[PDB]
Amino acid sequence: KDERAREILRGFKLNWMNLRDAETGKILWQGTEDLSVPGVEHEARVPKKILKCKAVSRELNFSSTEQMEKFRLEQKVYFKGQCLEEWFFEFGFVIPNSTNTWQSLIEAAPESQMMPASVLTGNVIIETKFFDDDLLVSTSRVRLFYV
Amino acid sequence: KSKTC
Ligand SMILES: *C/C=C(/C)CC/C=C(\C)CC/C=C(\C)CCC=C(C)C
């Protein structure tokens, strides 16, 4: 089970990922680091004007040698160690040895609830748990700078 | 609705 988790994780690869303003269509951010790798605090700089988008299209392209019955993510957004938000995304079935693109639309809260960049930058950690159904495959973390 | 994206 920890053995399976490890073969799933050993077989997995976040190839690329984009964040795009869903109104203008422009890409605001893209990385190709396997920000999915556990045991390390990754970092990411995003342009602070991302906070002004009404919605952001996140596009993730991933490979998996192993099949997954129900690939999904749970992402907690921590601010100075305090959980502000909890997001759940489901891809579903993953064919063995595939490469897949997963798109998700993340909609902004009303403006009066958006957090300012100056308060967020450097203080936000996104903690992502990678599951196949109920098997926790890994947990990765990213610290965000809004530059 | 996200407050941080
Ligand atoms: C929508 C705007 C913001 C600022 C969120 C930015 C989030 C980033 C840069 C990190 C994304 C982390 C992910 C998608 C988890 C990757 C881990 C696996 C695929 C297991």
Which of A63, A101, A114, A126 has most ligand 1 atoms within 8 Å of its beta carbon, as the pocket-test mutant? A126
Q: What is the resolution of this structure in A?
A: 2.1
Distance from residue A37's CA to the centre of ligand 1 (Å) = 12
Taking the C-alpha atoms of A91, A24, A56 and A137 in order, what is their torsion angle to the nearest 10 degrees?
A: 40
- Residue whose C-alpha is closest to residue A136's, from A59, A74, A76: A74
- Residue whose C-alpha is closest to residue A42's, from A32, A52, A50, A51: A32
Give residue A103's region: left, alpha or beta (phi > 0; psi -120 to 50).
beta
Taking the C-alpha atoms of A7, A10, A11 and A15 in order, what is their torsion angle to the nearest 10 degrees?
A: 150
Q: Do B3 and A109 touch (CB under 8 A)?
A: yes
**Going by CA atoms, what residue is nearest to atom 4 of ligand 1?**
B5
- DSSP codes joined into one string, A59-123: EEEEEESS-EEEEEEEEEEEETTEEEEEEEEEEEEE-TTEEEEEEEEEEBPPGGGPPPHHHHTTT
Q: At residue A120, what are phi and psi to the nearest 5 degrees?
A: -80, -40
Distance from residue A69's CA to the centre of ligand 1 (Å) = 22
Place of tokens 């903690």: A127
A105 touches chain B (CB under 8 A): no
As its CATH architecture, domain A1-147 has Distorted Sandwich (2.70)
Q: Using CA atoms, how far apart are residues A19 and A30, in angstroms rounded to an integer?
A: 6
